[PDB]
Ligand binder design. Structure first.
Ligand SMILES: Nc1ncnc2c1ncn2[C@@H]1O[C@H](COP(=O)(O)OP(=O)(O)OP(=O)(O)O)[C@@H](O)[C@H]1O
Ligand SMILES: Nc1ncnc2c1ncn2[C@@H]1O[C@H](COP(=O)(O)OP(=O)(O)O)[C@@H](O)[C@H]1O
Ligand SMILES: Nc1ncnc2c1ncn2[C@@H]1O[C@H](COP(=O)(O)OP(=O)(O)O)[C@@H](O)[C@H]1O
Lengths: 370, 75, 370, 370
């Protein structure tokens, strides 16, 4: 009996260890109302969380507590974890030990303060923080190979060979789902359809998930988009109003492969995956090309795998065979790994206990992280 | 001044600028290392009359004809 | 054609026209179409069903005001064509549009359909030699005569902050919010009804804009002025009747700096300025704080510069020099910039010729914009 | 030749240029090509798409930085051509390349293709009378005015140790390691992200280099200073914001002494020096240990001399006299050596003439360099 709780910037995936898929999946947001001095009606919650805030988007100002895999407002994150254990999962945190997930190369204060809350506020019996990328490999039953776990908050590239990780080869890029969502708003505003508010940004994320797809040749796709209106698809908003996004459909996910569009002055998700493999030892490169995994929900774009293969193959040597690993459950790839890890009898020892936390302090986490 | 006097919707008796109040080697002094004073004029004089023999010179990774020592002698 | 170019500012509230030779705009009239309020069947009433600028101001109470441009976007194009036709009337300028070339001043990050249709009208309806669409922010710097400078241009329709350093505008650091002078006029009408004076009519909305422009001061501390008993300064209406404004005077334009009070999800005028600087690169931040320029009519509020300086200082880093350099001609700054730009021989290269638009295509106007 | 020969110290971090005989290099500017990343909209902005040296330093925030040479190997030659062109331009020495001979200063044990292309550019693109390529270490000894000494030259790009006894330099005892000042700045950036301050931008990476030079001390005992709670020393960024560096201050420069931290299997700077002496013949070991000369900018770290003297003493034999001598101008020591060598009449014989290069080709340069 143990709890796996993925603390993703976009969506918080929580559930019991051993189960196939996560029990409760809700958007990680806190909804505070745009209140005036006028008195409010009955059935009023001071701050709404998750699926409740997703229902009452109209009035509530949606504030994401985790920004680029860094917890900015801890009071907000506490209210999400309270919604996770007590309401969503229907379980006491004192009974079950809780596994959390942190992105690699995050600030040290993040891991420090995270565990402090779990030990003091919720009074958990044991707490282990893990790298999202390390878990994602277990999903595919692969010990060897690199992963390109692109989330809503961040995208990170962690090469692991024969159950041994290369820490110095790890590269983090701040370009992620939320930056693409923010980019899609700007180009939709250029077409005509203006989306400004926090509630409207959530509707633009629903537009992104459904329509947007990765093009094989961007320049070739822009030529077909100009000539014919075949790529132009219609989407119905919450309001009866319908919109035809056009070429901006395949223009949004292009930002992943060339950040110049967003204006970050950084390497693309294809180029960073190559650079990470080159930073590793020369011998093991072979297996990393052969076992390139794509994880998170930012790798569920239709035809990212085809475009990824093409771009890596061009950069990589001709003799090498480049196979991209795209399992059907990419969105729940971080959690399903956690469920496999927590269930294993070997992992029982690796848990950090309250007694261990009390004596040493919150600094113990940095030793027993990975 | 007379240009802006002509127009109706102009700021009159307002300050133009709103501004804030105007607010007004450790290794090179180490014990371990011995600090030398570089005098190129002195250095130039010491090497002044020193020459090199560029005849039969080959520093390259050429195997032929045993070992070689570049810059044979002066004068 | 060598004949003098005609600058025209597309201000949502007031459009400012004139020749490039003039130091100031000779002809500037309100941007609204005036039709008779009662649907005219009979003779002896207001004839034509069109009253623009000074003719409208004379017979204002009889007519019904309808603004053609909202939030820096043209809603009714038929109305805007009549307005631009009145610019080339006997009343203002008194010239052929076919002879003189034109310069438009569209707000930043507007819809591309707005720019394309604006060009189509000015090339097809009027037989213009050449047209050039430009950004309102870039012009404001030419007027003042400095290359570096952030331009907080608070218009009637839109308030936007564009950072430009050494003649280089960062397009990602641009910030645009819809809460502008027109919204302040709308919110003042609500507070005037809370004082007990209704301005229900579209004509009666114009005198609320006059009340705002005459008497509305921005308090340095809003909470202290609320507790203090007001003088209740009397304003005289067109009919002759007096109205005591009282606390509505100062707590109306406050909604610029704090738009959450009414319940509008926006950043605020102090916030968009700071955010635009913070979004830009770290090296430039100090110089961009050291060079801020106020543009448009919604900066002329009494004690705007005093409040903004205070609200920027607390958000901005400590011990940083913040100079908010307002010109004396803030309302007419955007046009004067265009008048200088138009006069230069470089402008001859920048604009798009009528024959160029026929051959090149639609993109011609967009690609030459920058 | 009557015209003085120009000394150019082609350093990875800073390229130092000047005329032979001069006591100090008159014109020393940072080695990078700055291109504007933001768009030009206004007229009168900064002219050219290439900014090099002091103009690039002033307008750093506007530009995207790109180092042409990495680890003493010219990666992009087009860029290296533009910086050498800028040395001869009006801003720096302001003379024709055809009239003055050149003295280039490359690092030891660099690729042969680098020396070949370096010559090709300096003879074809610039029609120079004569070029001599020399080692950095050999010059550093002429500056101090000593015939016997080992030269530990820790530069920005590469750190190397060359044992030189009574004029002769032992080519098999040369020790070179890629880990250097620029890897310390790269390793500092990684630890600053762990502390929770991000510097993703190429312009922001130059601020990390500024933080390194100002606030980073090498602790005499590494394991001792790790455990003890450190005083969190605040540093002021260009914008004004304060960062607490904390443990990253002293952990960052330790990379030079322990290359295992970044994860490269190479010798430490302390191991490089002793290995270079131990590789030399038995008789000269005592004289080389007695005569140690530190060079390059990366030796200027606070407590470098103290730590190195501690580390060398443990690896070196018992009861041997270890005197580490520092010239006050460590940074400019390499160039001053070049000026003294260039001023001697013996340098005339050492040169490769245009005709000599044109006849034999690449071989002539490889024959006469060390
Ligand atoms: N099918 C899809 N196609 C395209 N984009 C998607 C799709 N599903 C989700 N996304 C986008 O990618 C993000 C994926 O978030 P996800 O559910 O993987 O959680 P997360 O916060 O990224 O967690 P983690 O970092 O642990 O992977 C969403 O926020 C959304 O913006
Ligand atoms: N003297 C003033 N005091 C206060 N508000 C003013 C004043 N003059 C104009 N305004 C406000 O500013 C608006 C004018 O905006 P304007 O500068 O013409 O915008 P644009 O830059 O788009 O042309 C008016 O409609 C009014 O709301
Ligand atoms: N005061 C300082 N403290 C620490 N490191 C420094 C200091 N000054 C310069 N450096 C480092 O030394 C570098 C300069 O290298 P330099 O000696 O000019 O190279 P080269 O010897 O290859 O010509 C800088 O880029 C920086 O990384």
């Amino acid at each position: 009996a143990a709890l796996v709780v993925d603390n993703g910037s976009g969506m918080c995936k929580a559930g019991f260890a051993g189960d196939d898929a996560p029990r409760a999946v809700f958007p990680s947001i806190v909804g505070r109302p745009r209140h005036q001095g006028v008195m409010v009606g009955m059935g009023q919650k001071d701050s709404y969380v998750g699926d409740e805030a997703q229902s009452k988007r109209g009035i509530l100002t949606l504030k994401y507590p985790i920004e680029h895999g860094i917890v900015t407002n801890w009071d907000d994150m506490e209210k999400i974890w309270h919604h996770t254990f007590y309401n969503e999962l229907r379980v006491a945190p004192e009974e079950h030990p809780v596994l959390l997930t942190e992105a690699p190369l995050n600030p040290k204060a993040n891991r420090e303060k995270m565990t402090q809350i779990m030990f003091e506020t919720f009074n958990t019996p044991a707490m282990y923080v893990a790298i999202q990328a390390v878990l994602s490999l277990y999903a595919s039953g692969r010990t060897t190979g690199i992963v390109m776990d692109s989330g809503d908050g961040v995208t990170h590239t962690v090469p692991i060979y024969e159950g041994y990780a290369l820490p110095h080869a790890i590269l983090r890029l701040d370009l992620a789902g939320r930056d693409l969502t923010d980019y899609l708003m700007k180009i939709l505003t250029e077409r005509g359809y203006s989306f400004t508010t926090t509630a409207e940004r959530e509707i633009v994320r629903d537009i992104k998930e459904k329509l947007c797809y990765v093009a094989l040749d961007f320049e070739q796709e822009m030529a077909t988009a100009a000539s014919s209106s075949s790529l132009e698809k219609s989407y119905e908003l919450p309001d009866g109003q319908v919109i035809t996004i056009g070429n901006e459909r395949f223009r949004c996910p292009e930002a992943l492969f060339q950040p110049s569009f967003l204006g970050m002055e950084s390497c693309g998700i294809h180029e960073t995956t190559f650079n990470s493999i080159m930073k590793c030892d020369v011998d093991i490169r072979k297996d990393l090309y052969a076992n390139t995994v794509l994880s998170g929900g930012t790798t569920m774009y239709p035809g990212i795998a085809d475009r990824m293969q093409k771009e890596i193959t061009a950069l990589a040597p001709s003799t090498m065979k480049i196979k991209i690993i795209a399992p059907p459950e990419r969105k729940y790839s971080v959690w399903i790994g956690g469920s496999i890890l927590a269930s294993l009898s070997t992992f029982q020892q690796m848990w950090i206990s309250k007694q261990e936390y009390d004596e040493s302090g919150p600094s113990i986490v940095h030793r027993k992280c990975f | 001044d007379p240009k802006y006097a002509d127009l109706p919707g102009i700021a009159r008796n307002e300050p133009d600028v709103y501004e804030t109040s105007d607010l007004p080697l450790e290794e090179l002094t180490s014990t371990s290392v011995e600090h030398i004073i570089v005098n190129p004029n002195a250095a130039y004089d010491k090497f002044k009359d020193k020459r090199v023999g560029t005849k039969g010179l080959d520093f390259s990774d050429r195997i032929g004809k045993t070992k070689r020592t570049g810059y044979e002698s002066g004068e | 054609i060598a004949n003098q170019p005609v600058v025209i500012d597309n201000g949502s509230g007031v459009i400012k026209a004139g020749f490039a030779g003039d130091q100031i705009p000779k002809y500037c009239f309100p941007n609204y179409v005036g039709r008779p309020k009662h649907v005219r069947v009979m003779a002896g009433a207001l004839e034509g069903d069109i009253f623009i600028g000074p003719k409208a101001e004379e017979h204002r109470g009889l007519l019904s005001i309808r603004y053609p441009m909202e939030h820096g976007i043209v809603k009714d194009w038929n109305d805007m064509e009549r307005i631009w036709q009145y610019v080339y009337s006997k009343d203002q300028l008194q010239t052929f549009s076919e002879e003189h070339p034109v310069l438009l001043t569209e707000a930043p990050l507007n819809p591309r359909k707005n720019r394309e249709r604006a060009a189509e009208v000015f090339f097809e309806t009027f037989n213009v030699p050449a047209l050039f669409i430009s950004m309102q922010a870039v012009l404001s710097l030419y007027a003042t005569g400095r290359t570096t400078g952030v331009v907080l241009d608070s218009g009637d329709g839109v308030t936007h902050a564009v950072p430009i350093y050494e003649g280089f505008a960062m397009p990602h650091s641009i910030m645009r919010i819809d809460i502008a002078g027109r919204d302040v006029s709308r919110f003042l009408r609500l507070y005037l009804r809370k004082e007990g004076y209704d301005f229900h009519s579209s004509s009666e909305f114009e005198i609320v804009k006059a009340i705002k422009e005459r008497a509305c001061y921005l308090s340095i501390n809003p909470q202290k002025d609320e507790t203090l008993e007001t003088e209740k300064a009397q304003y005289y209406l067109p009919d002759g009747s007096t109205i005591e404004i009282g606390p509505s005077r100062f707590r109306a334009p406050e909604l610029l700096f704090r738009p959450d009070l009414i319940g509008e999800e926006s950043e605020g005028i102090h916030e968009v300025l700071v955010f635009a600087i913070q979004k830009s690169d770290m090296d430039l931040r100090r110089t961009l704080f050291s060079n801020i320029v106020l543009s448009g009519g919604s900066t002329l509020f009494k004690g705007f510069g005093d409040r903004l300086l205070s609200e920027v200082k607390k958000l901005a880093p400590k011990d940083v020099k913040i100079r908010i350099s307002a010109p004396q001609e803030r309302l007419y700054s955007t046009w004067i910039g265009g008048s200088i730009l138009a006069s230069l021989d470089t402008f001859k290269k920048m604009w798009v010729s009528k024959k160029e638009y026929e051959e090149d295509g639609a993109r011609s106007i967009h690609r030459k914009t920058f």
